[PDB]
Structures are given as C-alpha cells and as structure tokens.
Tab-separated table of N, CA and C and ligand atoms in Angstrom:
chain	number	residue	atom	x	y	z
N	1	UNK	N	14.053	-5.174	16.028
N	1	UNK	CA	13.378	-5.882	14.938
N	1	UNK	C	12.043	-5.195	14.728
N	2	UNK	N	12.034	-4.207	13.839
N	2	UNK	CA	10.906	-3.314	13.688
N	2	UNK	C	10.607	-2.979	12.248
N	3	UNK	N	9.315	-2.909	11.903
N	3	UNK	CA	8.858	-2.498	10.581
N	3	UNK	C	7.843	-1.419	10.771
N	4	UNK	N	7.997	-0.285	10.049
N	4	UNK	CA	7.025	0.822	10.014
N	4	UNK	C	6.227	0.713	8.718
N	5	UNK	N	4.906	0.779	8.817
N	5	UNK	CA	3.998	0.726	7.661
N	5	UNK	C	3.183	1.995	7.675
N	6	UNK	N	3.531	2.929	6.764
N	6	UNK	CA	2.767	4.171	6.624
N	6	UNK	C	1.597	3.919	5.714
N	7	UNK	N	0.389	4.236	6.182
N	7	UNK	CA	-0.850	3.958	5.440
N	7	UNK	C	-1.626	5.230	5.181
N	8	UNK	N	-2.508	5.201	4.182
N	8	UNK	CA	-3.352	6.310	3.804
N	8	UNK	C	-4.793	6.087	4.158
N	9	UNK	N	-5.616	7.139	3.903
N	9	UNK	CA	-7.067	7.020	3.706
N	9	UNK	C	-7.353	5.859	2.737
N	10	UNK	N	-8.533	5.290	2.896
N	10	UNK	CA	-9.047	4.320	1.924
N	10	UNK	C	-10.056	5.025	1.013
N	11	UNK	N	-10.024	4.683	-0.267
N	11	UNK	CA	-10.968	5.199	-1.258
N	11	UNK	C	-11.575	4.016	-1.949
N	12	UNK	N	-12.887	3.783	-1.734
N	12	UNK	CA	-13.524	2.567	-2.269
N	12	UNK	C	-12.695	1.306	-1.901
N	13	UNK	N	-12.191	1.311	-0.654
N	13	UNK	CA	-11.419	0.201	-0.102
N	13	UNK	C	-9.958	0.158	-0.455
N	14	UNK	N	-9.480	1.026	-1.345
N	14	UNK	CA	-8.094	0.991	-1.787
N	14	UNK	C	-7.255	1.956	-0.961
N	15	UNK	N	-6.067	1.527	-0.545
N	15	UNK	CA	-5.144	2.355	0.218
N	15	UNK	C	-3.728	2.048	-0.198
N	16	UNK	N	-2.810	2.951	0.185
N	16	UNK	CA	-1.378	2.859	-0.097
N	16	UNK	C	-0.634	2.513	1.214
N	17	UNK	N	0.382	1.655	1.073
N	17	UNK	CA	1.241	1.262	2.178
N	17	UNK	C	2.688	1.424	1.735
N	18	UNK	N	3.457	2.205	2.531
N	18	UNK	CA	4.897	2.407	2.333
N	18	UNK	C	5.609	1.787	3.518
N	19	UNK	N	6.586	0.918	3.245
N	19	UNK	CA	7.332	0.231	4.296
N	19	UNK	C	8.656	0.929	4.571
N	20	UNK	N	8.879	1.245	5.853
N	20	UNK	CA	10.169	1.789	6.311
N	20	UNK	C	10.636	3.023	5.576
N	21	UNK	N	9.683	3.809	5.130
N	21	UNK	CA	9.988	5.093	4.535
N	21	UNK	C	10.780	5.064	3.248
N	22	UNK	N	10.785	3.935	2.519
N	22	UNK	CA	11.479	3.885	1.248
N	22	UNK	C	10.870	2.765	0.408
N	23	UNK	N	11.141	2.784	-0.903
N	23	UNK	CA	10.655	1.704	-1.788
N	23	UNK	C	11.369	0.424	-1.355
N	24	UNK	N	10.629	-0.535	-0.802
N	24	UNK	CA	11.300	-1.689	-0.168
N	24	UNK	C	10.486	-2.952	-0.164
N	25	UNK	N	9.379	-3.000	-0.956
N	25	UNK	CA	8.498	-4.165	-0.964
N	25	UNK	C	8.619	-4.908	-2.288
N	26	UNK	N	8.790	-6.228	-2.249
N	26	UNK	CA	8.735	-7.068	-3.430
N	26	UNK	C	7.287	-7.424	-3.746
N	27	UNK	N	7.035	-7.952	-4.949
N	27	UNK	CA	5.647	-8.331	-5.277
N	27	UNK	C	5.118	-9.417	-4.310
N	28	UNK	N	5.959	-10.413	-3.968
N	28	UNK	CA	5.503	-11.457	-3.025
N	28	UNK	C	5.231	-10.880	-1.654
N	29	UNK	N	6.099	-9.980	-1.176
N	29	UNK	CA	5.873	-9.359	0.136
N	29	UNK	C	4.589	-8.536	0.103
N	30	UNK	N	4.316	-7.850	-1.009
N	30	UNK	CA	3.149	-6.996	-1.141
N	30	UNK	C	1.872	-7.804	-0.934
N	31	UNK	N	1.779	-8.966	-1.596
N	31	UNK	CA	0.566	-9.782	-1.423
N	31	UNK	C	0.395	-10.211	0.034
N	32	UNK	N	1.523	-10.590	0.661
N	32	UNK	CA	1.466	-11.016	2.061
N	32	UNK	C	1.083	-9.875	2.992
N	33	UNK	N	1.604	-8.685	2.711
N	33	UNK	CA	1.308	-7.515	3.517
N	33	UNK	C	-0.164	-7.171	3.413
N	34	UNK	N	-0.713	-7.155	2.184
N	34	UNK	CA	-2.148	-6.877	2.075
N	34	UNK	C	-2.977	-7.934	2.819
N	35	UNK	N	-2.548	-9.207	2.747
N	35	UNK	CA	-3.269	-10.267	3.472
N	35	UNK	C	-3.325	-9.988	4.970
N	36	UNK	N	-2.271	-9.394	5.536
N	36	UNK	CA	-2.273	-9.073	6.969
N	36	UNK	C	-3.288	-7.987	7.325
N	37	UNK	N	-3.682	-7.161	6.318
N	37	UNK	CA	-4.755	-6.175	6.453
N	37	UNK	C	-6.112	-6.764	6.004
N	38	UNK	N	-6.252	-8.112	5.905
N	38	UNK	CA	-7.484	-8.720	5.382
N	38	UNK	C	-7.848	-8.127	4.005
N	39	UNK	N	-6.808	-7.897	3.198
N	39	UNK	CA	-6.915	-7.209	1.923
N	39	UNK	C	-6.171	-7.965	0.845
N	40	UNK	N	-6.347	-7.519	-0.398
N	40	UNK	CA	-5.705	-8.096	-1.555
N	40	UNK	C	-5.076	-7.005	-2.375
N	41	UNK	N	-4.191	-7.362	-3.306
N	41	UNK	CA	-3.700	-6.338	-4.248
N	41	UNK	C	-4.896	-5.907	-5.098
N	42	UNK	N	-5.109	-4.598	-5.290
N	42	UNK	CA	-6.280	-4.161	-6.083
N	42	UNK	C	-6.184	-4.641	-7.513
N	43	UNK	N	-7.360	-4.887	-8.126
N	43	UNK	CA	-7.385	-5.004	-9.582
N	43	UNK	C	-7.270	-3.598	-10.177
N	44	UNK	N	-6.975	-3.520	-11.479
N	44	UNK	CA	-6.940	-2.230	-12.164
N	44	UNK	C	-8.340	-1.571	-12.065
N	45	UNK	N	-9.450	-2.356	-12.232
N	45	UNK	CA	-10.774	-1.749	-12.118
N	45	UNK	C	-11.025	-1.182	-10.701
N	46	UNK	N	-10.599	-1.908	-9.651
N	46	UNK	CA	-10.762	-1.394	-8.290
N	46	UNK	C	-9.973	-0.097	-8.113
N	47	UNK	N	-8.755	-0.049	-8.637
N	47	UNK	CA	-7.922	1.151	-8.539
N	47	UNK	C	-8.555	2.313	-9.295
N	48	UNK	N	-9.081	2.058	-10.507
N	48	UNK	CA	-9.739	3.141	-11.250
N	48	UNK	C	-10.930	3.714	-10.493
N	49	UNK	N	-11.711	2.856	-9.815
N	49	UNK	CA	-12.855	3.370	-9.060
N	49	UNK	C	-12.343	4.210	-7.883
N	50	UNK	N	-11.290	3.733	-7.193
N	50	UNK	CA	-10.701	4.515	-6.084
N	50	UNK	C	-10.239	5.888	-6.546
N	51	UNK	N	-9.544	5.951	-7.686
N	51	UNK	CA	-9.114	7.201	-8.319
N	51	UNK	C	-10.310	8.154	-8.472
N	52	UNK	N	-11.422	7.601	-8.994
N	52	UNK	CA	-12.606	8.423	-9.242
N	52	UNK	C	-13.199	9.012	-7.983
N	53	UNK	N	-12.979	8.368	-6.829
N	53	UNK	CA	-13.471	8.818	-5.533
N	53	UNK	C	-12.522	9.806	-4.832
N	54	UNK	N	-11.361	10.077	-5.413
N	54	UNK	CA	-10.434	11.044	-4.832
N	54	UNK	C	-9.048	10.531	-4.498
N	55	UNK	N	-8.710	9.283	-4.839
N	55	UNK	CA	-7.398	8.732	-4.480
N	55	UNK	C	-6.300	9.153	-5.425
N	56	UNK	N	-5.232	9.746	-4.860
N	56	UNK	CA	-3.998	9.946	-5.605
N	56	UNK	C	-2.833	9.819	-4.660
N	57	UNK	N	-1.695	9.406	-5.201
N	57	UNK	CA	-0.417	9.389	-4.453
N	57	UNK	C	0.681	9.913	-5.376
N	58	UNK	N	1.896	10.027	-4.841
N	58	UNK	CA	3.052	10.328	-5.645
N	58	UNK	C	4.101	9.213	-5.514
N	59	UNK	N	3.639	7.962	-5.382
N	59	UNK	CA	4.531	6.825	-5.167
N	59	UNK	C	4.140	5.616	-5.991
N	60	UNK	N	5.120	4.959	-6.593
N	60	UNK	CA	4.866	3.694	-7.281
N	60	UNK	C	4.455	2.613	-6.283
N	61	UNK	N	3.455	1.817	-6.656
N	61	UNK	CA	3.079	0.682	-5.834
N	61	UNK	C	2.427	-0.417	-6.634
N	62	UNK	N	2.551	-1.646	-6.146
N	62	UNK	CA	1.922	-2.776	-6.812
N	62	UNK	C	0.410	-2.702	-6.754
N	63	UNK	N	-0.200	-3.108	-7.880
N	63	UNK	CA	-1.564	-3.628	-7.930
N	63	UNK	C	-1.425	-5.030	-8.555
N	64	UNK	N	-2.560	-5.720	-8.777
N	64	UNK	CA	-2.486	-6.983	-9.501
N	64	UNK	C	-2.005	-6.698	-10.944
N	65	UNK	N	-0.910	-7.293	-11.348
N	65	UNK	CA	-0.443	-7.212	-12.708
N	65	UNK	C	0.484	-6.080	-13.069
N	66	UNK	N	0.490	-4.955	-12.323
N	66	UNK	CA	1.289	-3.804	-12.722
N	66	UNK	C	1.745	-3.049	-11.487
N	67	UNK	N	2.635	-2.079	-11.718
N	67	UNK	CA	3.074	-1.101	-10.739
N	67	UNK	C	2.564	0.264	-11.220
N	68	UNK	N	1.881	1.020	-10.359
N	68	UNK	CA	1.154	2.192	-10.788
N	68	UNK	C	1.280	3.358	-9.826
N	69	UNK	N	0.831	4.525	-10.279
N	69	UNK	CA	0.633	5.716	-9.467
N	69	UNK	C	-0.735	6.281	-9.846
N	70	UNK	N	-1.735	6.324	-8.950
N	70	UNK	CA	-2.990	7.021	-9.276
N	70	UNK	C	-2.774	8.537	-9.165
N	71	UNK	N	-3.188	9.264	-10.207
N	71	UNK	CA	-3.023	10.717	-10.259
N	71	UNK	C	-4.311	11.420	-10.643
N	72	UNK	N	-4.663	12.415	-9.860
N	72	UNK	CA	-5.801	13.278	-10.167
N	72	UNK	C	-5.282	14.588	-10.763
N	73	UNK	N	-4.396	15.266	-10.032
N	73	UNK	CA	-3.898	16.568	-10.453
N	73	UNK	C	-2.552	16.433	-11.111
N	74	UNK	N	-2.343	17.061	-12.277
N	74	UNK	CA	-1.012	16.984	-12.898
N	74	UNK	C	0.045	17.630	-12.011
N	75	UNK	N	1.125	16.898	-11.787
N	75	UNK	CA	2.263	17.432	-11.049
N	75	UNK	C	3.514	16.912	-11.764
N	76	UNK	N	4.435	17.822	-12.145
N	76	UNK	CA	5.599	17.447	-12.932
N	76	UNK	C	6.499	16.389	-12.308
N	77	UNK	N	6.516	16.301	-10.979
N	77	UNK	CA	7.375	15.314	-10.314
N	77	UNK	C	6.620	14.056	-9.852
N	78	UNK	N	5.346	13.904	-10.260
N	78	UNK	CA	4.568	12.722	-9.932
N	78	UNK	C	4.068	12.127	-11.213
N	79	UNK	N	4.625	10.993	-11.640
N	79	UNK	CA	4.174	10.304	-12.852
N	79	UNK	C	4.283	11.163	-14.102
N	80	UNK	N	5.360	11.939	-14.195
N	80	UNK	CA	5.636	12.766	-15.366
N	80	UNK	C	4.434	13.626	-15.827
N	81	UNK	N	3.720	14.236	-14.866
N	81	UNK	CA	2.590	15.135	-15.120
N	81	UNK	C	1.311	14.466	-15.658
N	82	UNK	N	1.275	13.133	-15.640
N	82	UNK	CA	0.114	12.415	-16.126
N	82	UNK	C	-1.013	12.444	-15.108
N	83	UNK	N	-2.236	12.202	-15.612
N	83	UNK	CA	-3.399	11.957	-14.765
N	83	UNK	C	-3.936	10.555	-15.092
N	84	UNK	N	-4.815	10.065	-14.235
N	84	UNK	CA	-5.348	8.727	-14.358
N	84	UNK	C	-4.458	7.741	-13.615
N	85	UNK	N	-4.716	6.443	-13.790
N	85	UNK	CA	-3.858	5.429	-13.208
N	85	UNK	C	-2.635	5.309	-14.117
N	86	UNK	N	-1.513	5.881	-13.694
N	86	UNK	CA	-0.283	5.869	-14.484
N	86	UNK	C	0.405	4.533	-14.285
N	87	UNK	N	0.728	3.852	-15.367
N	87	UNK	CA	1.360	2.544	-15.314
N	87	UNK	C	2.846	2.657	-15.590
N	88	UNK	N	3.660	2.155	-14.668
N	88	UNK	CA	5.104	2.082	-14.885
N	88	UNK	C	5.393	1.109	-16.003
N	89	UNK	N	6.151	1.574	-17.006
N	89	UNK	CA	6.499	0.737	-18.157
N	89	UNK	C	7.891	0.190	-18.033
N	90	UNK	N	8.905	1.064	-17.821
N	90	UNK	CA	10.292	0.646	-17.883
N	90	UNK	C	11.022	0.966	-16.601
N	91	UNK	N	11.545	-0.064	-15.958
N	91	UNK	CA	12.356	0.104	-14.749
N	91	UNK	C	13.338	-1.039	-14.664
N	92	UNK	N	14.529	-0.761	-14.143
N	92	UNK	CA	15.490	-1.839	-13.893
N	92	UNK	C	15.126	-2.680	-12.680
N	93	UNK	N	14.406	-2.109	-11.721
N	93	UNK	CA	14.339	-2.574	-10.344
N	93	UNK	C	12.992	-3.151	-9.954
N	94	UNK	N	12.952	-3.849	-8.802
N	94	UNK	CA	11.832	-4.708	-8.465
N	94	UNK	C	11.060	-4.341	-7.217
N	95	UNK	N	11.528	-3.350	-6.430
N	95	UNK	CA	10.946	-3.048	-5.123
N	95	UNK	C	10.233	-1.714	-5.121
N	96	UNK	N	8.990	-1.720	-4.652
N	96	UNK	CA	8.152	-0.531	-4.694
N	96	UNK	C	7.384	-0.428	-3.373
N	97	UNK	N	6.396	0.454	-3.310
N	97	UNK	CA	5.413	0.416	-2.240
N	97	UNK	C	4.300	-0.573	-2.674
N	98	UNK	N	3.202	-0.659	-1.928
N	98	UNK	CA	2.069	-1.437	-2.411
N	98	UNK	C	0.793	-0.683	-2.237
N	99	UNK	N	-0.195	-1.047	-3.042
N	99	UNK	CA	-1.580	-0.752	-2.771
N	99	UNK	C	-2.252	-2.011	-2.240
N	100	UNK	N	-3.331	-1.818	-1.489
N	100	UNK	CA	-4.148	-2.900	-0.924
N	100	UNK	C	-5.592	-2.516	-1.095
N	101	UNK	N	-6.478	-3.534	-1.116
N	101	UNK	CA	-7.918	-3.385	-1.273
N	101	UNK	C	-8.625	-4.196	-0.202
N	102	UNK	N	-9.429	-3.512	0.609
N	102	UNK	CA	-10.222	-4.136	1.641
N	102	UNK	C	-11.713	-3.976	1.261
N	103	UNK	N	-12.374	-5.090	0.986
N	103	UNK	CA	-13.752	-5.076	0.530
N	103	UNK	C	-14.734	-4.602	1.532
N	104	UNK	N	-14.402	-4.651	2.830
N	104	UNK	CA	-15.287	-4.265	3.923
N	104	UNK	C	-15.202	-2.772	4.284
N	105	UNK	N	-14.308	-2.016	3.627
N	105	UNK	CA	-14.152	-0.590	3.888
N	105	UNK	C	-15.364	0.163	3.305
N	106	UNK	N	-15.526	1.443	3.656
N	106	UNK	CA	-16.638	2.238	3.107
N	106	UNK	C	-16.507	2.413	1.586
N	107	UNK	N	-17.626	2.721	0.915
N	107	UNK	CA	-17.591	2.780	-0.558
N	107	UNK	C	-16.861	3.976	-1.141
N	108	UNK	N	-16.759	5.094	-0.404
N	108	UNK	CA	-16.161	6.282	-0.987
N	108	UNK	C	-14.883	6.649	-0.192
N	109	UNK	N	-14.702	7.916	0.167
N	109	UNK	CA	-13.503	8.314	0.906
N	109	UNK	C	-13.645	7.994	2.366
N	110	UNK	N	-12.664	7.279	2.923
N	110	UNK	CA	-12.608	6.976	4.340
N	110	UNK	C	-11.244	7.454	4.862
N	111	UNK	N	-11.242	8.659	5.446
N	111	UNK	CA	-10.022	9.242	5.984
N	111	UNK	C	-9.946	9.123	7.491
N	112	UNK	N	-10.604	8.110	8.048
N	112	UNK	CA	-10.324	7.721	9.429
N	112	UNK	C	-8.985	6.975	9.443
N	113	UNK	N	-8.400	6.855	10.633
N	113	UNK	CA	-7.150	6.157	10.800
N	113	UNK	C	-7.323	4.637	10.829
N	114	UNK	N	-6.231	3.941	10.540
N	114	UNK	CA	-6.146	2.484	10.636
N	114	UNK	C	-5.594	2.170	12.038
N	115	UNK	N	-6.327	1.332	12.776
N	115	UNK	CA	-6.063	1.048	14.184
N	115	UNK	C	-5.903	-0.436	14.483
N	116	UNK	N	-5.600	-1.256	13.463
N	116	UNK	CA	-5.427	-2.684	13.654
N	116	UNK	C	-4.686	-3.270	12.462
N	117	UNK	N	-4.016	-4.430	12.675
N	117	UNK	CA	-3.358	-5.212	11.616
N	117	UNK	C	-3.943	-6.583	11.897
N	118	UNK	N	-5.192	-6.827	11.414
N	118	UNK	CA	-6.004	-7.923	11.962
N	118	UNK	C	-5.597	-9.329	11.646
N	119	UNK	N	-4.836	-9.497	10.590
N	119	UNK	CA	-4.517	-10.812	10.113
N	119	UNK	C	-3.039	-11.094	10.035
N	120	UNK	N	-2.235	-10.386	10.847
N	120	UNK	CA	-0.843	-10.783	10.985
N	120	UNK	C	-0.779	-12.091	11.787
N	121	UNK	N	0.342	-12.763	11.684
N	121	UNK	CA	0.523	-14.026	12.373
N	121	UNK	C	1.577	-13.888	13.452
N	122	UNK	N	1.720	-14.936	14.270
N	122	UNK	CA	2.689	-14.909	15.364
N	122	UNK	C	4.089	-14.672	14.802
N	123	UNK	N	4.882	-13.872	15.500
N	123	UNK	CA	6.253	-13.665	15.067
N	123	UNK	C	6.963	-12.675	15.945
N	124	UNK	N	8.214	-12.366	15.611
N	124	UNK	CA	9.060	-11.585	16.531
N	124	UNK	C	9.190	-10.102	16.227
N	125	UNK	N	8.581	-9.620	15.149
N	125	UNK	CA	8.774	-8.246	14.701
N	125	UNK	C	7.824	-7.286	15.352
N	126	UNK	N	8.311	-6.099	15.778
N	126	UNK	CA	7.403	-5.039	16.203
N	126	UNK	C	6.946	-4.318	14.930
N	127	UNK	N	5.683	-4.466	14.596
N	127	UNK	CA	5.121	-3.861	13.401
N	127	UNK	C	4.298	-2.662	13.843
N	128	UNK	N	4.623	-1.481	13.291
N	128	UNK	CA	3.920	-0.258	13.638
N	128	UNK	C	3.209	0.316	12.427
N	129	UNK	N	1.902	0.471	12.545
N	129	UNK	CA	1.078	1.164	11.548
N	129	UNK	C	1.130	2.628	11.891
N	130	UNK	N	1.555	3.435	10.923
N	130	UNK	CA	1.682	4.870	11.062
N	130	UNK	C	0.689	5.547	10.139
N	131	UNK	N	-0.249	6.279	10.710
N	131	UNK	CA	-1.219	7.030	9.941
N	131	UNK	C	-0.645	8.367	9.510
N	132	UNK	N	-1.280	9.023	8.529
N	132	UNK	CA	-0.808	10.308	8.050
N	132	UNK	C	-0.913	11.379	9.137
N	133	UNK	N	-1.903	11.250	10.041
N	133	UNK	CA	-2.040	12.164	11.166
N	133	UNK	C	-1.102	11.797	12.342
N	134	UNK	N	-0.202	10.837	12.143
N	134	UNK	CA	0.816	10.468	13.118
N	134	UNK	C	0.361	9.441	14.125
N	135	UNK	N	-0.944	9.166	14.214
N	135	UNK	CA	-1.410	8.158	15.163
N	135	UNK	C	-0.873	6.797	14.771
N	136	UNK	N	-0.515	6.002	15.790
N	136	UNK	CA	0.128	4.726	15.572
N	136	UNK	C	-0.550	3.581	16.300
N	137	UNK	N	-0.400	2.391	15.723
N	137	UNK	CA	-0.884	1.135	16.284
N	137	UNK	C	0.267	0.149	16.123
N	138	UNK	N	0.685	-0.508	17.198
N	138	UNK	CA	1.791	-1.459	17.101
N	138	UNK	C	1.414	-2.806	17.641
N	139	UNK	N	2.018	-3.845	17.061
N	139	UNK	CA	1.828	-5.214	17.557
N	139	UNK	C	3.006	-6.062	17.153
N	140	UNK	N	3.268	-7.085	17.962
N	140	UNK	CA	4.354	-8.014	17.689
N	140	UNK	C	3.811	-9.095	16.755
N	141	UNK	N	4.508	-9.385	15.665
N	141	UNK	CA	4.047	-10.427	14.772
N	141	UNK	C	4.930	-10.596	13.574
N	142	UNK	N	4.335	-11.125	12.518
N	142	UNK	CA	4.978	-11.302	11.231
N	142	UNK	C	3.890	-11.356	10.183
N	143	UNK	N	4.245	-11.008	8.947
N	143	UNK	CA	3.337	-11.148	7.813
N	143	UNK	C	4.002	-11.789	6.600
N	144	UNK	N	5.336	-11.868	6.553
N	144	UNK	CA	6.054	-12.347	5.376
N	144	UNK	C	6.108	-13.844	5.377
N	145	UNK	N	5.646	-14.463	4.309
N	145	UNK	CA	5.648	-15.914	4.187
N	145	UNK	C	6.798	-16.435	3.327
N	146	UNK	N	7.502	-15.573	2.583
N	146	UNK	CA	8.610	-15.994	1.708
N	146	UNK	C	9.937	-15.623	2.373
N	147	UNK	N	10.832	-16.597	2.621
N	147	UNK	CA	12.118	-16.333	3.279
N	147	UNK	C	12.979	-15.277	2.588
N	148	UNK	N	12.963	-15.244	1.248
N	148	UNK	CA	13.738	-14.262	0.488
N	148	UNK	C	13.315	-12.819	0.769
N	149	UNK	N	12.089	-12.613	1.310
N	149	UNK	CA	11.621	-11.284	1.693
N	149	UNK	C	12.029	-10.907	3.126
N	150	UNK	N	12.528	-11.847	3.927
N	150	UNK	CA	12.922	-11.560	5.307
N	150	UNK	C	14.415	-11.269	5.440
F	201	LIG	C1	-12.768	-2.954	7.218
F	201	LIG	S1	-12.270	-1.350	7.874
F	201	LIG	O1	-12.746	-0.226	7.100
F	201	LIG	O2	-12.913	-1.047	9.159
F	201	LIG	N1	-10.574	-1.234	8.053
F	201	LIG	C2	-9.699	-1.536	6.930
F	201	LIG	C3	-9.042	-2.732	7.032
F	201	LIG	C4	-7.743	-2.578	6.110
F	201	LIG	C5	-7.782	-1.030	5.741
F	201	LIG	C6	-8.528	-0.400	6.674
C-alpha cells in the first residue's frame, strides 16, 4: 500500500506534484494532497508569478479553476510550443498531476529538496516524497478525504 509523490523546486511557493509516475489525480484528491503539504491549489496569479521566477514543467496539473502547464521555453511536445501559463481547453478526461502553493516557502526559486509531508493524517499508506535529485522522505499515513479517490 504505497504512493510515490514526485515533487519539484518551489518558485514563489508553487511546485508540481506527480503521483505514481502517471496522470492519476482527481481535482478533489489534488486539493487534499496540497493540504497535506500545508498548501493550496495555486491561483492563476500565484502561478503567473511562479512562471516569472523560472517555473516551467511539461505536465498538465490542476490550479484553482483550470488545468495548466507553465512554459518558459517553446518546446513542440510541451503545450503545443506555447509559452506562458498554457490553459488546457479540451479534454475528454479528468485526471492530471497537481500544482500546490505553500505561502511559507521562499519568494523566488527554491531548489532545495522537500523533506516532510507535514499535514498528512493517520492512515495505512506508505507515502514517499521523491525529489528530482532522487532523495526521498517516507511516512505512513493518508491524505485522501474522498472515498471515490481511494
Ligand atoms: C515552508 S518550506 O519552504 O520550508 N517547505 C514547503 C512546504 C511544502 C513545499 C515545500
């Protein structure tokens, strides 16, 4: 009973979380997951500021209200070569990665590793935070509050 959460650098408090190496998070799970990081789904304004500080990914993820990809450099296989906060318009499907916003993080680029999941609750799952540099932090718990997400 294990969940892997791959996380990024934070940029103005905003970071990306990918669960189990594939698009697998619902919007309700996303809010709960960010809550376990003492975080919230970013607003579009928070995401735009993070973009300006150096944040980009090549993965769709929830923010408040939309599913997006922040892009700095045009790349043909990431958001159809767009730059800026690219907003997903048309999709059949409902599961993506998530973004999260932690207000207590540094104001600009923070590429230190994540070494805690401070607000998870008691539960039976081995949850492992996986950093881009491969360093890991694991703890037994749960974060999902909606049964349909479990
Ligand atoms: C508040 S902090 O910068 O030390 N750590 C954050 C908490 C969630 C993302 C990383």
